[PDB]
Amino acid sequence: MKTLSLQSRAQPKEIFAFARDIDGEFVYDQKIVKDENVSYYYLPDSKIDGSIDLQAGYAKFKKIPEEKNMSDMKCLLTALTKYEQEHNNGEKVNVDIITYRGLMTKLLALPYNLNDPVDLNVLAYDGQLFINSDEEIELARRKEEDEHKQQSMTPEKYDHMKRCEFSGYKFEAIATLPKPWADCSRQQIDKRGKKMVNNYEQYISVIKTGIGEAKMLLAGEVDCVWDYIPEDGKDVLSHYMELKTTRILESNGQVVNFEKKLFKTWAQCFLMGIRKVVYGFRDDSFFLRDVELYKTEEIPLLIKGKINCTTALKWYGAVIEWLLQEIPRDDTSKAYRVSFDPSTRTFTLRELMGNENSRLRNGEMLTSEFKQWRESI
Amino acid sequence: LVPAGSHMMKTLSLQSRAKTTALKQPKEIFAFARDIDGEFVYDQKIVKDENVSYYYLSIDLQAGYAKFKKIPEEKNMSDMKCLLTALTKYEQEHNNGEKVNVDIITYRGLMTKLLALPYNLNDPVDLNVLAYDGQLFINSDEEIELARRKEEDEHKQQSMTPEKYDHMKRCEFSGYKFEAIATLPKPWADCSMVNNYEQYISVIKTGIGEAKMLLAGEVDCVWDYIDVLSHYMELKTTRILESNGQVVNFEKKLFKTWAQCFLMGIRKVVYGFRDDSFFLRDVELYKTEEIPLLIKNNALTESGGKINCTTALKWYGAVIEWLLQEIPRDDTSKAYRVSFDPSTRTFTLRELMGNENSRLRNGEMLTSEFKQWRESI
């Protein structure tokens, strides 16, 4: 086991996308993903008047079982395989690390969320590091946390919490359209507040980026398009936006808690090259009362221990460099666990058992089809 | 344990839309005709001198119904053979022995089905497509068409009274009767039973986006004299507009008429309006270019929903661009099926097996005469 002191200090572009459909199946064709799997922002000021009910339709929420909603490296590799075959001249993508934005967000946000655990699996294959959350650990963590909530909250509060979760998806539904306005039917526009809401559908952008000298492929869910998707398909990232919801702010204490969320939102968007985020603010009856659009670049200054985004990024840089330094890049006989333990506040890198390596390399992280592809090159 | 889709099939989103592009001006390059005896006429002088009608216009549109000379519908399917016969003659005699300079060769009616699709989601489409001599040839499928009309007819017997079934046949006759009573066989100065054998077919060069296309289409009459397209006119009939429901019925027809005329560069359309007793009560002249605004300004309604001609055209542009992108132009070893399935609302492109390819290339679509000609160039 190796240990990285917490005191350690060191232009994104989308290259492909994929989606999960309403039935939980994955969609890989680039054209169809762009044509019918990403929505467009539409929320006129006239409707931010307190009439929009973000808990309406809760009972028919189509919710994916959490066991099928963990970060999945397999679909990422399936999409990557297609990209390499069809758009990278049959060559492997030129990065050092392949992972999900949400996992990197956990690393970036760590210095100011020392109460949150982190557990990541890392393994070297074909000269690249593949990083994902651990299925077993994650599933158990989610189960434990929900069971704890059910047990420690009144029935009313627990149901209220579930409705808050729902309201985020509901906000996305009532603040977006499936196509540009000019290509929508009147029914598609006028009847969005009644449309069934689901969390099966996801649009996943995969970007090439990096930090310091590290090159990274990062996959992340994107909520919508702010204006349009460039016809020539260039610099599409700058056209995306995130959509969040939170409670109205009625006191100083609530504002400080909002800054903590803002930090996490900055981390998510910054890593992904997303330049805009809209927050919807709702009351305890779930009515939409205010909306605010933030530029990602200004969030650090809207935030006023003491959160420092620069320090966070220097820490993140140090973690990434450390992994690249400490994990033998061409040794495929081992797998590693990167862990942050909140009870001792230690950030650790350890070698997993051979059988854990076997599990990861033969299904959980790497797929047979991806390995066969990379072998064939 | 069954694939979600065939590995030999690709899907186009119904939401796909091309950017609006410059209007293309169609131009006639040759014509051919089918005579009263059902024989084809290819000589340009003879076709123009003997096979063209001229507009000239109580009147009972079901009169003479008893003698309607109706060609057997299985002898009236769109025929690539006659088109290729006419095209060969054109290439030999007027194009300096070179192939016509287009990407796609097909019939107007088939393209109309694609253009009108967004507002006709219950109507199936099935087209055969194949690459030959650097060009795509597109026709309906003979067997599918045969089965489909019979299927629909059985469905009618099964759902209609003998009288209403009879009423539907008289409605069909009334259109041909209107043409007969509203035209002369020659210009007035030379004029000293109803049938659907006689057809005058204009073949035009046109385009959409970057695609160049040859389209063959029946033309009803000349409005003044033989830029020949600008001298043609379409003739249609429909029931008088005595209720909102009839306005609904008319709008669907008027949109299809716009699509047909727009694609062919026909600039004028006359509708005859008839009552229950099939008396002609009103006649209205339209310019094709004014139809989209008439439809837009109609409060009554029916991308599904309100018909929008611009949206239709953007869909059509997307379809044509997609076909040209997805079907290898220089591979003559394969044939394709383009299909819209109303039950699933999916638009797909599927590679046919070798024996279907052979059937199309060796008689049904390509003729031996046409292939020998193109080879000799």
Residue numbers in the entry:
A (entry chain B): 2 to 11, 18 to 311, 322 to 394
B (entry chain A): -6 to 50, 58 to 192, 203 to 236, 242 to 317, 320 to 394
Which statements did the authors publish about this structure?
Rai1 homologs share several highly conserved sequence motifs, and our structural studies show that they are located in the active site region, mediating the binding of the divalent metal ions and/or the RNA.
The CaRai1 and SsRai1 structures are especially similar, consistent with the 58% sequence identity between them. Therefore, AgRai1, CgRai1 and SsRai1 have a distinct 5′ triphosphonucleotide hydrolase (TPH) activity and do not have PPH activity. At the same time, there are substantial differences in the positions of the helices, the connecting loops and even some of the β-strands among some of the structures, and these differences are especially pronounced for the β4-αA loop, αC and αD helices and the connecting loop, which form one wall of the active site pocket.
